[PDB]
Ligand binder design. Structure first.
Ligand code: CHL
Ligand code: CHL
Ligand code: CLA
Ligand code: CLA
Ligand code: CLA
Ligand code: CLA
Ligand code: CLA
Ligand SMILES: CC(/C=C/C=C(C)/C=C/[C@@]12O[C@]1(C)C[C@@H](O)CC2(C)C)=C\C=C\C=C(C)\C=C\C=C(C)\C=C\[C@@]12O[C@]1(C)C[C@@H](O)CC2(C)C
Ligand SMILES: CC(=C/C=C/C(C)=C/C=C/C=C(C)/C=C/C=C(\C)C=C=C1C(C)(C)C[C@H](O)C[C@@]1(C)O)/C=C/[C@@]12O[C@]1(C)C[C@@H](O)CC2(C)C
Ligand SMILES: CC1=C[C@H](O)CC(C)(C)[C@H]1/C=C/C(C)=C/C=C/C(C)=C/C=C/C=C(C)/C=C/C=C(C)/C=C/C1=C(C)C[C@H](O)CC1(C)C
Ligand SMILES: CCCCCCCS[C@@H]1O[C@H](CO)[C@@H](O)[C@H](O)[C@H]1O
Ligand SMILES: CCCCCCCS[C@@H]1O[C@H](CO)[C@@H](O)[C@H](O)[C@H]1O
Ligand SMILES: O=P(O)(O)OC[C@H](O)CO
Length: 156
């Protein structure tokens, strides 16, 4: 459908925004890449910024399935098509998007950032399969030497 696509788009976009930022922050602070994060979290303890966290891989997913499930449902429990995209309310404490004249601008920025992130995460992904290294690394690598770190060195 259509309206549904407007949801699909913004939703994936909001995830893609947190993800990308997330992938970079973890590599920049713990040295662990986003692709390995799963394995090292499973093999070594559950942790965040080095510190250890009790939860096992098991009680870990139970909590996820139950907690994201519950919320994904509550969200789906509303067909006011215009809130299925801009729920507002508790989701807008500061009330930045309260004023109707500002709304369109803010929504334009949000959709651009969201489309941008998705694109970038797509990159993040392909860049992992191809280089076996993290995004933050490829980036500081291409910067250290712009000419000899392109994707042409692969074929050449
Ligand atoms: C019951 C608890 C509940 C909680 C904890 C969450 C939590 C979350 N939701 Mg969900 N939701 C919840 C209820 C509902 N959601 C939605 C509709 C949405 C939408 C449409 C979206 C989310 C998204 C998200 C995330 C982003 C929050 C943010 O934007 O930062 C700013 C805000 C804060 C730091 C405060 C945290 C929120 C919390 C206290 C909300 C509790 C809601 C209620 C009081 C009930 C509804 C009445 C409201 C409108 C007054 C976050 C994981 C987004 C997502 O999935 O990202 C990809 C997204 O796009 N939720 C509806 C209405 C249809 C709900 C109804 O009960
Ligand atoms: C939502 C998106 C999501 C995505 C795109 C990935 C992507 C990835 N995970 Mg991952 N995960 C995701 C969510 C989660 N993961 C994990 C736990 C793990 C672990 C423990 C490991 C990965 C690994 C991997 C990688 C290899 C998959 C493969 O085919 O190699 C072949 C397969 C494997 C090596 C075994 C891993 C199976 C894996 C795909 C996990 C299944 C998780 C689920 C999506 C389901 C649970 C939650 C429900 C609520 C959605 C890849 C980078 C592995 C990695 O680090 O290697 C590079 C790894 O060791 N993930 C949890 C649990 C809390 C998740 C929750 O949603
Ligand atoms: C899709 C979103 C997403 C997802 C699924 C994950 C998933 C994961 N992350 Mg990532 N991460 C994200 C977003 C996400 N992250 C973002 C947006 C950031 C930036 C702050 C990070 C930063 C981050 C770090 C630094 C680390 C992880 C780690 C982890 C692992 C779990 C630990 C945990 O949940 O502790 C539960 C959560 C917490 C203890 C609370 C986090 C604090 C919140 C509330 C942040 C508020 C941010 C604020 C201070 C910054 C604003 C700046 C602005 C003014 C400029 C797991 C692989 C750890 C790992 O070892 O991975 C391998 C790890 O060390 N992530
Ligand atoms: C645990 C329970 C749970 C529950 C109750 C729901 C329920 C819902 N979600 Mg949610 N979601 C969850 C967890 C959950 N989600 C988690 C943990 C995430 C990851 C952050 C998401 C991310 C998410 C997104 C991004 C979207 C939804 C959407 C939806 C709705 C439709 C589901 C569907 O039919 O697609 C089932 C379909 C598939 C599994 C097909 C896969 C998609 C393909 C084309 C892409 C292949 C790419 C690849 C990178 C995927 C990852 C694989 C990986 C394991 C390696 C529904 C309200 C959709 C929505 O709101 O629609 C308008 C939507 O767009 N959810
Ligand atoms: C959308 C933003 C984006 C950005 C900022 C980057 C940035 C980078 N990529 Mg890349 N990448 C992207 C998307 C992106 N990628 C996507 C969607 C894919 C899949 C087709 C890939 C696949 C890819 C591979 C397989 C490799 C890189 C690599 C690199 C780095 C070096 C130069 C190179 O050869 O790129 C080649 C670029 C492409 C195939 C990208 C296609 C689309 C771009 C040109 C359009 C976006 C415009 C952009 C220039 C500016 C907007 C960004 C904004 C932040 C300013 C550099 C850090 C290399 C690396 O990691 O080495 C250090 C590498 O080997 N990229
Ligand atoms: C920069 C991209 C961006 C932008 C411009 C917007 C713009 C808009 N959004 Mg979002 N939104 C985004 C990303 C973005 N959003 C992401 C990633 C999520 C997922 C958390 C959402 C989820 C979301 C919901 C659910 C709602 C909105 C709403 C709104 C409106 C009001 C608030 C505002 O103006 O903030 C403008 C942006 C900024 C000032 C930048 C923020 C600086 C932050 C704190 C730094 C990074 C944080 C990080 C490290 C981790 C936090 C994660 C989390 C789980 C809380 C406006 C149309 C509300 C609406 O439509 O109400 C009327 C609403 O209810 N959006
Ligand atoms: C290279 C140049 C370039 C240029 C010029 C711009 C310019 C702009 N970008 Mg883009 N962008 C670029 C490249 C560029 N970008 C690239 C390559 C990317 C990477 C993919 C992006 C990604 C991007 C994102 C992700 C975002 C932008 C946004 C914006 C806008 C800034 C804020 C705004 O809209 O005003 C806001 C308005 C006001 C302060 C005033 C109110 C409105 C008035 C009435 C109209 C304005 C004109 C008026 C005064 C003049 C006519 C009067 C006449 C009757 C006499 C701006 C139009 C942002 C946006 O769209 O947010 C809104 C945003 O979030 N850009
Ligand atoms: C949601 C998304 C990514 C989400 C990622 C998440 C949650 C990641 C989570 C984690 O990583 C962290 C943070 C930390 C790690 O340690 C662990 C995990 C758990 C792995 C990507 C979407 C990515 C979405 C993409 C790339 C979408 C591309 C769409 C295209 C090209 C559309 C094209 C067209 O629509 C036009 C423009 C016009 C038309 O005429 C027709 C067509 C042709 C259809
Ligand atoms: C994707 C995501 C989702 C979080 C969801 C949460 C927190 C849901 C809570 C969801 C919470 C829910 C539903 C709570 C429900 C509580 C209720 C009913 C309890 C109660 C009651 C009442 C009211 C009856 C009243 C009675 O008098 C008392 C009592 C006590 O009995 C988080 C991602 C990240 O954390 C990572 C992974 C890594 C980080 O770096 C960054 C970010 C991005 C932040
Ligand atoms: C709602 C509300 C409410 C109330 O009222 C108020 C408030 C609080 C204000 C609000 C909130 C908000 C928020 C939270 C937000 C967030 C955001 C984000 C995160 C973004 C991102 C965003 C993001 C984005 C764009 C991104 C992008 C990305 C990209 C391009 C990338 C690229 C790349 C790649 C590929 C690769 C290589 O290697 C390198 C690089 C270069 C790295
Ligand atoms: C997909 C796994 C399901 C995760 C758990 C969702 C609990 S969902 C919860 O149930 C109440 C009573 O039945 C009603 C409301 C509903 O949102
Ligand atoms: C199917 C559409 C459910 S719609 C949902 O209903 C709630 C009240 O029960 C309202 O408070 C909320 O604003 C509205 O979007
Ligand atoms: O679409 P933006 O946000 O990249 O802006 C493009 C400029 O308007 C071109 O003049």
């Amino acid at each position: 459908g259509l309206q549904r696509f407007r949801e699909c788009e913004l939703i994936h976009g909001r995830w893609a925004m947190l993800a990308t930022l997330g992938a970079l922050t973890v590599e920049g602070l713990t040295g662990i890449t986003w692709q390995d994060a799963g394995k090292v979290e499973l093999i070594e303890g559950s942790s965040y910024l080095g510190q250890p966290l009790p939860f096992s891989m098991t009680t870990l997913i139970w909590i996820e399935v139950l907690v994201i499930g519950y919320i994904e449902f509550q969200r789906n429990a509303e067909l006011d098509t215009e809130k299925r995209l801009y729920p507002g309310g508790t989701f807008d404490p500061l009330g930045l998007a309260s004023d109707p004249e500002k709304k369109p601008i803010l929504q334009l920025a949000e959709i651009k950032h969201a489309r941008l992130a998705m694109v970038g995460f797509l990159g993040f992904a392909v860049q992992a399969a191809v280089t076996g290294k993290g995004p933050l690394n490829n980036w500081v690598t291409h910067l250290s030497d712009p000419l000899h770190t392109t994707i042409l060195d692969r074929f050449l």
